[model samples]
Each structure stands twice: as C-alpha cells, then as structure tokens.
Target: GQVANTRIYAAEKLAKVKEKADSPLYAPAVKTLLRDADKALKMTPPSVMDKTMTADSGDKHDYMSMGPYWWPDPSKPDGLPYIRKDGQRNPELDKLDRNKLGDMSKAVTTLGLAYYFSGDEKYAQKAVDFLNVWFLDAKTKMNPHLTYGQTIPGKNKGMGRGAGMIDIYSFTEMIDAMTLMENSKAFTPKVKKGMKEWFTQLVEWMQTSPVAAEEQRAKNNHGLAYDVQLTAYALYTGNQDLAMKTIQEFPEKRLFAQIEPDGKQPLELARTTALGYTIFNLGHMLDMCSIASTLGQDIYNATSQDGRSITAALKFLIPYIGKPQSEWPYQQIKEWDKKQEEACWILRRASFFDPKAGYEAIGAQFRETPANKRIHLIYSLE
Candidate 1:
C-alpha cells in the first residue's frame, strides 16, 4: 500500500476516501471537511507578530502566553506572584500567541485534508498561505522555541515554563497536514524546503533550550508531550535516526516510568481531570505508535518487562465506555462527558495496532448523527 506520507493516518485510507469522496457513504464527511476548509479560506493567515503582547525578549515572533490556571494573588497589592488555580483557565491567555498558534495549525490541517479529497487548488493555496506567514515570512515567522511560554507576570522572570510546550501540540497534527499537501501544486519545493528548515531549527531549539530541558524532566503527560513533538519534528526535519532513538527510548522513558503494569497513570490520576489527562496521555502514545509503525518500530505492542504497554493503558478505560461518569471514581471535576466522547476517537485510532481493539463496539456506545462528523474522514470506521 502506497501510503500518503501522512504521519498518523494510513495513506491508503486517504486515497480510498479521495477516490469515493462523492459516494453516498463519504459525502457527508467530505462535506464536513470542506466546510471547515471554507472557513479557513476566509481566515487571516496568522502570524506570531500578530500577538498584542510581546515576549519578555521584546520580540513578537518569540511565541509567548500566560499560565492557564494561574491567578493573581488577592492578598498582594499588585499580585506580585500568581497562584495556581488548577483546572480553571486564566482569561489572559487569550491576549497572546497560544490560541493563535493552535488556530493556525488547525486551519492548515483542515485545508490540507480538504484539498486532498476535493482536489481543489483553493484549499491547497490557503494551506500554503498559512504556512508561509507562520514559518517562512521573514517578518512574521515564529522563533522556533517555547522559551517564553507560560510567562508568569511576577515570577521566574517571565520565562516560559515547561508546561507551556503542550500548547503547540497542534503542530504535530499540522505536520501530518503538510504531508497531505505534497502532491498539490501549491506546495512547491521551495516552500517544503523552508518548512523543513523551520522544523529543523525547532527541533534544534527543543534540544538546546532551558525551557525544553525543564519539560524533559516532567514525569506526567507534559513530558510525553515533548517526546511526541521531538519524535515527530525529528522525522519532519529528515532526522529519522533521532526520531527512532526517541521511539526506542519510549518503553523506558514514558512507558515504564509513567504507567503501571495495571495501566494506571499515577501522575495523571493526581490531577483534577484525572480521567481526561489519562486519556490525553494515551492519545500521545497512540500518535507515537502510529508514527513508529511507519518506520518499523512497534511502540503499539511493545510491553515493558513489567508489562507496561499501550494496550494495558487503553483497557483501563474500556469498561467505562457505556457507564456513567459517576462510576469513573476519579477527579473529573468538569467535562467528564467530554472526555468520554474523546475516548472513542482513541479506540478508532488504536485500530492500526489491534484490528479487534473494540473500535466499532466502543464507538457504538457513543452514537450521534453521523453526517457532518469530520472525524469520519480522518479515520475509517471499518
């Protein structure tokens, strides 16, 4: 099967959907994808320079944002140091590049897949425009580091915290979208080269930055998030050796260290959104597995000596599929139902590793109007 060079999804699947895009079974999903792309076409191509607040470095291109759960200390006269209010997002985050960065990544992904199925140059053109402004434009291209993220106004000298790296996790999905555009005329060689260079610098920064160093030591999902970006960007930058090294380290670095033999993620369980974070971390592992499979690495089925494996972790939540959140017995203070909906996607994605991994049956537990569900185009139900 000639895969489409997509990182997470199967190439044959993309081609198959493209071929029958207008057929009854795929028409609604294709319509949904294109609808999102249409919105992308009208969006202003985002730039790091567009942020109202500049990084502490006085550079707008240096991506910067505030801590999500941190709040001003009410006892202080000027809130000299912010306090952590876990699970409650701080509104000031909207004044920075974090949300803008995610929007750019999502728009590019939508446009790329839309072009692949619709064969519309317009979609590819918009995708290219976003890439150009976000990474290649001299005046607007983002500085390839998370050095100034989570800038607490009165602490850590406003340096970016390791936790902030999770904000750009969308780039991993966006990179897959770039591969989808390779066959399109709008994705010229020069643009591809520039993007690769951008990612090359990004991976290099991830290696050298103090911020990334801090993230590397994170024991929870934050650390695994870095590995996902590192492995994916290393591959994107044509450093498969680096990518493979990261994948090889997975069983030890993330698997054995983070997950118990019984599939419980202790660190994630400590969070207010325990079930959600557990599922979120599993999503990262699944992405790693999909990427590793393309390179002949089997992170999907690899079990540590102690029996820590992706399968075990996923099975932890399988029984909860049709059950109520009250039965979850974890600290999901809010959005318990949202996490349940997210779990079905995890099952569908796990299909690549284990064909009988309960994708269909688990999916059936959460049924809705199938039409206009864009996820159908991303992964095959069968």
Candidate 2:
C-alpha cells in the first residue's frame, strides 16, 4: 500500500508529459496549484503564530533541536542532542540562539507561491493576507535572527549549533513565488507594495542583525543557507547589487575558505551525519546556484582553484554517495538512512550545465520525484 515509489513513477511520467504539454494546458495547470493553495488558506488562521510556542523535550517527542542538515555528534557520551561546534561536542543546547518561527515563514511562502503562479485572485488574496499577519502586522511578526536555534541540551541557553540556519531554505522558494506573482493583475498594486515592504524590512533585518551576522559566520551548510536565503530575499526586494554581491563573494570569501582543497567541508567532516551533511549542504548550495542563475549570477562558474565548481562539488560527493560507508573519508557519521535522491538534483542541474550523456545517465539511475515534494520544499518551502 505504500505509494512513495508509485508516486515517484507517476510523477516522472507527468514530468515527461509536462515537458511537451501545450501552453494552454501548462498555464492552467500552474493555476490549479494556486487554486488549491487559495482554498487551503481559507482554513489557515491569520494569527497562526500566536499559539506557536517552543516545544521543549518534555512537551514533544520530536523537538526541533537537531539540524535538518546534520546529525548528532557520536563522540558525546549522550547523543540525543547535537554537538555545537566543529569537531567538538556540546551535549546541551538549552541556552543557544534559536529561531522558533523559521518553518512558519516557509509555510507562508509555499502557499503564497501556489497563489502567485496560478494568477487566481483568491489564491493571491489569501497569500497576501497570510503574509500580512505573519510579517507585516506589527502585532504578530517575529524577530529576524535565530539567536537560539539548536540548543546544547541543558547547558547553554539555546542551541548554538551553526547549522540551524538550514530551516530558512523554505523562504528561498517564497522569493521565487514573488516572481511568479509579478504578472498578477488580481492583486492590487497596494497589496503588492505592502508585500514588498515586508520583504524589504525582513531583508534589512537579515543583513544587519546580530543573529543573522552570526549565521553568516557559520562555516558549514548553515552558512551556505544564510547566503542562499539572503540572496533570494535581496533579489526579490530589488536589492540586485547586494544579491549579486553575495553570489559573487560568498563562494570566494566563505565557501573557498571553509571547504578544503581536497573537496571536504571540514565542518561537515566532523559530524556524525557527515555523509548526510555533505549531501545536504551541497544540495542546498546547488539550489542556491540554480536561483543565482535566475537572478543573473553565474555561481556554477564561480569557483576556486582547489576544486569548488558546482561540478567539482558533485564529483567530490558522488563516489562517497555511491558507497557512503566505505568511500566516505569522514570519521564521524551517526545516521545512514537519511540519504536518498540528492544525487539526482546534482545530476539534473548538471545536465542543464553540460548536457552530457553521462549526466543524463546519472539522472536516469535515480527515479525522478514530484517537483512540489522535494525535501527542500517539504522542509523549507511549504
């Protein structure tokens, strides 16, 4: 009765059909996703965040403490919590900086994108209302920084883990959603202006705030996500210079400095979830790389001599992904089952880049999945 595989097969067929579908049907199909979102938002609460609280371990079994992009440190005597530093252990993350509302931003963005793409006024209206309540409304908005994300169990005030910024990946899709809505006549200019203003404020918060600054300094996937999120938001809000600047500078200033010449990300190499973190970080950066192209930057070509091209990133991880336990050079790895389909993303994008038969073969090896249900989408988008 499990349909994950079946759904994947069906989605592959649908994607194939969609590639050749007539404009008339394709346009309307995009609208349908929006209409569905419109209807869904009616039941969504305007003050949804009001009841949202940080669920402690005592209250919920799956407390959002661990990094979605990483696994716990195996070196720690107690492994329920994650380590807070590179190659070190911090069993408790209670006092570190964390953002409880990061996921909510993604939910809003996903529904909003669904509305924007469809040109359905109802969807656009609902999305606009949702955003107002979440970001624009002075009474209900959240702070921009995640000063306390993954807590160090009981020792620190909150999880000081650097990788927690991965939660904002959802908002990246939301920025794309705004591009979809650019042609919508249904949403009045007033609503559009207000939405833009909210994003502008949020972008400012992200650029200059203390928490965001800290996340920016992160050496691993979390830092890459910070660049992705900020760049997307900057592009959406017409901060083209800043967006381009980040795209051009991040890889050189941060990624090059942090990633070893041997293609190993030292920060991820130190984690028990090394394999997963490696894949997740590269996947997330590839997502950003795709978006950077959309925003007029060539991130795929921006690389350092040691081996930093997006292609190089793929080659670095492919061998390890093929036989993770054996080929992986990392010393730590706690969970092994989290790996799946990430290689497909690299392959798909690679096909777009070089269009080689080998890349196509790589893509063919892994089954295609529904675009809407990508891990980034599920975790960060909506």
Candidate 3:
C-alpha cells in the first residue's frame, strides 16, 4: 500500500529546479549547496559507536547524551542531584552522541543533495558510505530505540526521558537527503531496503516505548517536535495508514492544545529562552505543514475555532524581528542575535504560506548570505 505522501522536501519544486539548475535564479543557491557539499567531502563520517560512554542498557550502541539543562549542584560534593539551568547547557553534553548525530546529518544531507544535483558519484558514495556505518552496518549501526538519549545522571539512574527524542530530529531532514540520492549508482537497492527497515523499526519503538509515549503527550515544543519526527518516519517508511492517521489527528491532537487564540504558544513561552523556543516550535509546525501538504493535508492554514493557527503563531513572533532585544519582554538572556536569525529563517519558510504579509522582508533582513544559503536550495522560496 504505497502512500500518496510522507515527504518534507517540496517534491514538485525540487525536481523542477533540478531540471533547471543552470538557470540564473537557481545558480547562486545551487553553488552554495555544492560548496557545502565540498566541505562534506572533507568531513569525517559519524557513528554512535564513537561515544565514550555506555547507555543504562549497558550498550554503547544505544544512543545516549547527558541532559543539557542539568549540572552539578555546587552545594553537594557529589553533585548527586544536578540543578536546572533553563537556558544554560552544560559542556559535558557534547561528549555523547548528539553532536555526532548532527554532524552525520549535515554531511549526509549536503553530500546526498550534491549527488542529486551534480550527478556526482563521489558525493553519493560518501553519503551512502556514512549511512552504511551509522545505519546499515551491524558493527557500527546504532540500535533503533533511543532508550537512553539525553539522560540526566542523577535522574532515574540516568535513563533517558522522552525529551531525548528531540535529538534525532536531524533524521527528519536526513531522510529526505537520503531519498535525494536514490537515483545515483551509490544508492543501491540493498541500502534503500535497509533504510526503510531501520526507520520502520524505529517508528514501532516510538509507538510502544514508555519514554516515547511521554514525548508525544507533551504539551509544548517537545510534543510539536514529536509529531514531525513521527510523521516523517511514518512517511519515509511507507506506512501510509500511520502517516494519514497522524496527519488527521494533528489539528486536534496538537494545534488547538498548543496554540492560543492570540497565536501565542504558551508552552514554548514557559521556557527561559521563550522567544527562541517559540521560533523553534513554530519552525517545527511549519515543517509539519510542509510535510502534511506532501501527503495531501494542508494544516498550514488550518485554524482552531478560537482563531489559533500556524499563521497566528508565526505572526506572534513577526513584530519582534527588527525591534530592539528589550522589546521582546521575554527571558532570552543570551543568544538574542541567534534567536533573531532563527526567527528570520522560520519567517523565510513561512512567507510561502502568505506572500502578502511581508514575512520575507523580515527574514531577508537578517539572513547572512552564503553561510545560510543552503536553506535557499532546500526551501527554494523562489
């Protein structure tokens, strides 16, 4: 039962532009994408196998990372119960699999995309070569379940909570990059088959795992992120029934509960990095909308009875873009410029939903060229 959708990449747009890559409009962005591809060529392949620590499962192959918000309590000699620092991340969090996962994702995406556009075997081989170790190969491949992701050492004997699911959001984009490489020689039937099986296994684990259950039930960015990751995996795995079921339930399951009448995401606002979390969650929603459209659903414009919708949520952050940081009135104590840039990126993607609202104008002002141009090709606003 093949599904009509389960995709995040704008299927029509990517193929159309791929056919006309040499066109002046696309050349700049394509050049940017390829430039990253070259850097990807130099990047070392990543694997969960390299982490220095083991999960509570006593398996190093199980993905794991320390929770970013918790740190040693200065009062206690052993730091037995780490304290919470809302916006501050402990340096130790990087020693685990999370950063490596991001690196692998970035390399695969760039390499796979360059393969798609350039028809270069080197990029395709490298992308698949990385995929092989990280996913398909038995020795280096990570176990399907994220049973110990983002664990706080003193909490529950260091078992990963459901919040750790956010770590693999990288796969949402990486899956598409994987699909982009399918036509190339390096992307063989064996690897494709293995990938589908791997994702299907992961999705089943998410459906039944206790930690995963908690994540989907979350009221804020965690739940928002949970939905997109689930939908993407379902779509990629060709689980048409699950994909459709998830999409059908989205508005009621998440949208109404999370977005208020004023377009504010109260759950996101609860965080210390309120504006940053707000933008991050909306970015997830926008990803959801784009993914839904690929499957014949259009939640992008869907609104609750009380006037809440993605548009309202996005618009909530719009006024703060160029204004002074003090105008935000939120607790973004650090990374103000970073948050602004993040919002602009979301605005850039959101502009396609309502071209008349001047969203791109806001996004355009903050975008740093070349460095951020990869989105130009992936999102393709033009």
Query: Considering every candidate listed, which one attains the maximal TM-score?
Result: 1
> How well does model 2 score by local distance difference test?
0.56
As for TM-score, the candidate ahead, 2 or 3, is 3
Q: What's the C-alpha lDDT at position 78 in model 1?
A: 96
Ranking the candidates on lDDT from highest down gives: 1, 3, 2
What is candidate 3's local distance difference test score?
A: 0.84
RMSD of candidates 1 onward, in order: 1.5, 8.5, 2.6
Instruction: Arrange candidates by TM-score, descending.
Output: 1, 3, 2
TM-score per candidate: 0.96, 0.69, 0.94
The Cα local distance difference test for each model comes to 0.85, 0.56, 0.84
Show the lowest summed lDDT stretch of 10 residues, model 2: 1-10
| Preferred candidate (lDDT higher): 2 or 3 | 3
Ten contiguous residues minimizing lDDT sum, candidate 1: 363-372
Clashing pairs in 1: 4-11
TM-score for candidate 3, residues paired by index: 0.94
lDDT of 3 at 114: 88
The digit string of per-residue lDDT tens for model 2 on 112-138 reads: 556433435666566566666655566
Error (Å) of candidate 2 at residue 103 is 6.0
Report the lDDT tens digits of candidate 3 across residue range 1-382. Answer: 1111227777766776677778877888788888888888887788888988888788878999878889999899899788889989999888899888888888998898788889889999989888898988888998888889778877867788888999899799888888888878889999999999999999999999998998989888888889889989998888978888888898888888899888888878888899888988888888888888876798888888889888888878888987788798777878888888778778878887788988888778867655336666666754
